Ligand binder design. Structure first.
Ligand SMILES: Nc1nc2c(ncn2[C@@H]2O[C@H](COP(=O)(O)OP(=O)(O)OP(=O)(O)O)[C@@H](O)[C@H]2O)c(=O)[nH]1
Ligand SMILES: Nc1nc2c(ncn2[C@@H]2O[C@H](COP(=O)(O)OP(=O)(O)OP(=O)(O)O)[C@@H](O)[C@H]2O)c(=O)[nH]1
Ligand SMILES: Nc1ncnc2c1ncn2[C@@H]1O[C@H](COP(=O)(O)OP(=O)(O)OP(=O)(O)O)[C@@H](O)[C@H]1O
Ligand SMILES: Nc1ncnc2c1ncn2[C@@H]1O[C@H](COP(=O)(O)OP(=O)(O)OP(=O)(O)O)[C@@H](O)[C@H]1O
Ligand SMILES: [Mg+2]
Ligand SMILES: [Mg+2]
Ligand SMILES: [Zn+2]
Ligand SMILES: [Zn+2]
Lengths: 346, 345
DNA sequence: ATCTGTACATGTACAGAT
DNA sequence: ATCTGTACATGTACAGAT
DNA sequence: ATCTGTACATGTACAGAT
DNA sequence: ATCTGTACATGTACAGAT
């Protein structure tokens, strides 16, 4: 098949993984030890997340996601204007970051300042800190090795209480992964990251939960195991990610779109079509096509609910204007009806 | 038919409540005594096991199994005459039970304590059953409701890798899968004071069997509220009842026990891993195929421990050929005559 | 002398390489 | 089909701290 | 160290619907 | 006769308090 050849292209090479991982691990481990010392972030723990650790990173091992998570007991959340995803956090450490509440930007700034200092003390490899992109929770490292490698170091508050009310009807896996899995997942802590949209607001993260789902994605426990049957769930994810990555390289009109949109859409599809047999590798083309059809409906109807926070619409008018969505619809529709020309590109 | 039989075997909510309330009082009191004193068993934790906690108890809530498990670091095990299941253990509180940790010595003190604490119970009708030699159990007989047996089982907990005799056991890769198997084998393993000799312990996987019983499907949703019911547990019940009824009648079958049936059905669940191979609509076929399987075990004199493949529960050394031929005839009869014994009281 | 946070020891799933 | 590198979970040894 | 509070899975009991 | 919906009961994992 055509799509199998595309995935062959997208497949990471073990040589590149080794070289990327070795450098990334040195930098991260060093940053993590620095957080442990008079440091307000003493106690932070490393949590590897995103595509590389989910085995859905494509083309190159050039972007890695890490959470430096800090357990903060006895906190109270206030939901910020019924957004579902944004909260203010309240209660001689943390002293410097109180603002009458726990300021995201103040904590992020110190976190960042420390990172930057520790980065200057690295003569072992070519690494700098990318200029801060306002509103973003990330502190991003740019490494030169062989190639360019981005590492987004994400500060995260860990709460071990029950998940916020806004998530009660989220994570609708009962028909797919089931009730025991859902209950167990919801006993895991939840995370808040310093993303604004205000300077004191945090955003929920479920990167840990998304990771478990990606690596435990079948209705059968043996899905993709050595004594089970391979599905094409991850492969569809990759193909869709690549379509967006290629389109986004070309078209500035698509700046508002990101990979989390496609991750969220495919979670919905995996819920809608829970049976492993609905993701047979022999049906890769049909499965990818049905994913595209689903995504086009999301754009057309201007609706893509957060998998974990049903009332939060990632495709609302407030986040992405209609024109951007019409633009992306035409572009997907085109690729779909012309043999995916863009998959040959570069 | 078989549905009517299961209706009969179904425990009543009323009886469960009353049984559980009394059992929990006694157990909790015994458990506090193992601590609050200082003992030698300070640190023991409660682990509920067996049929009641697996939801495969039949007829009445009249037998409960509990492990008082004790974490013991620096265990070295020596396999006792290549049995697979029996070990001597080597090594601080437990000093008085040693050159080797003696099962019977530890069991005796454990038992003595229990007996003393039982004498101090005036609110409940409860005594300690006469010791059955070789047995790891300390058994309580409770009366106030009806008769209720509680087997309190001493268990050593080791956090190391499982003994090599188990390496090829737990063959769930095609059923529950590799991630499940790996995780299960990261759990501790247990030794209980069952002799064979007075210093020997036996491996227990009651914790693992419990997880399997409550996580028994190839689909994650098997028997969940947004999944489909299978008849796996129902077959277990019917088979347990056939043996329980037969054992009531025939002294020839003293050597057989419910663990044999549990072990056999684990093998069947491995052989037939698909949930659709255990559709409730096929209860009769499923029960029948279980019987066929069990008869083959008797005929071939072979029923390997699910966790310890080289340990044959149906060896000549453990159960005489004649006992196995006797049980075969009796099962074969019930099977070909509409299970008359299921209508018995 | 004893205690412990850090690092290592062991084992295997997943996926890429042969 | 088999072999191998990375990541990740759990257990435990031990130099440095008390 | 132990105890309680929360949340939900696994049961059963029974009436109304199919 | 069976199935579904609600209520009523126990068990159990884990967090926060003591
Ligand atoms: N692991 C993890 N990384 C996150 C999370 N949120 C954000 N990030 C990282 O931070 C990057 C930027 O976050 P965005 O949500 O894109 O924030 P932004 O750049 O201000 O806004 P947009 O790009 O317009 O969405 C992401 O691409 C991730 O690398 C999270 O919950 N978990
Ligand atoms: N939870 C648990 N209970 C056990 C275990 N081994 C034995 N028991 C309990 O102890 C009782 C007796 O165990 P058996 O192995 O039958 O002991 P026995 O009477 O010496 O031997 P048999 O002649 O085979 O009956 C069981 O019915 C259980 O209640 C074990 O590994 N775990
Ligand atoms: N808008 C968002 N809301 C919530 N979580 C998000 C959001 N954006 C990203 N994340 C989380 O952060 C993780 C890392 O983000 P990132 O943008 O690197 O995507 P990714 O899934 O790693 O894919 P890739 O890096 O290959 O594009 C995501 O997997 C997701 O768990
Ligand atoms: N011979 C044995 N070898 C290993 N484990 C055993 C053995 N006999 C019993 N067990 C374990 O002890 C548990 C309790 O045993 P018991 O005889 O009470 O059976 P059960 O499974 O509780 O069923 P029931 O009590 O309804 O007959 C079993 O479930 C099993 O885990
Ligand atoms: Mg990423
Ligand atoms: Mg029992
Ligand atoms: Zn799969
Ligand atoms: Zn089932």
């Amino acid at each position: 098949d055509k799509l199998k050849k595309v995935l062959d292209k997208l497949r990471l090479k073990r040589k590149d993984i080794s070289e990327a991982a070795e450098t990334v691990n040195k930098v991260v481990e060093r940053l993590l030890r620095r957080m442990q010392k008079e440091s307000e972030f003493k106690g932070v723990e490393q949590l590897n997340t995103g595509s590389y650790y989910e085995h859905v990173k494509i083309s190159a091992p050039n972007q890695f996601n890490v959470m430096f998570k800090l357990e903060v007991p006895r906190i109270e959340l206030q939901e910020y204007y019924e957004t579902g995803a944004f909260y203010l956090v309240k209660f001689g450490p943390l002293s410097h970051f109180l603002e009458g509440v726990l300021s995201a930007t103040k904590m992020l700034s110190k976190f960042r300042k420390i990172i930057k200092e520790e980065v200057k003390e690295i003569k072992d490899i070519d690494v700098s800190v990318e200029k801060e992109k306002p509103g973003s929770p990330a502190v991003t490292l740019l490494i030169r090795n062989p190639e360019e490698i981005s590492v987004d170091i994400i500060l995260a508050l860990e709460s071990k209480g029950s998940w916020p009310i806004s998530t009660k009807e989220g994570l609708p896996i009962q028909g797919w992964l089931g009730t025991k899995v859902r209950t167990n997942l919801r006993r895991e802590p939840f995370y808040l990251v310093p993303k604004n949209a205000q300077g004191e607001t945090w955003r929920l993260s479920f990167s840990h939960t998304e990771k478990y789902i990606l690596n435990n994605h079948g209705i059968e426990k043996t899905c993709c195991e050595s004594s089970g049957a391979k599905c094409c769930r991850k492969e569809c994810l990759k193909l869709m990610k690549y379509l967006l990555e290629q389109l986004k390289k070309e078209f500035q009109e698509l700046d508002a779109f990101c990979s989390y949109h496609v991750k969220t859409a495919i979670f919905h599809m995996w819920t809608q079509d829970p049976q492993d047999s609905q993701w047979d590798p022999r049906n890769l083309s049909s499965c990818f096509d049905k994913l595209l059809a689903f995504f086009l409906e999301c754009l057309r109807t201007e609706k893509l609910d957060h998998y974990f926070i049903p009332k939060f619409n990632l495709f609302s008018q407030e986040l992405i204007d209609r024109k951007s969505k019409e633009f992306l619809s035409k572009k997907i529709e085109y690729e779909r009806n012309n043999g995916f020309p863009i998959f040959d590109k570069l």
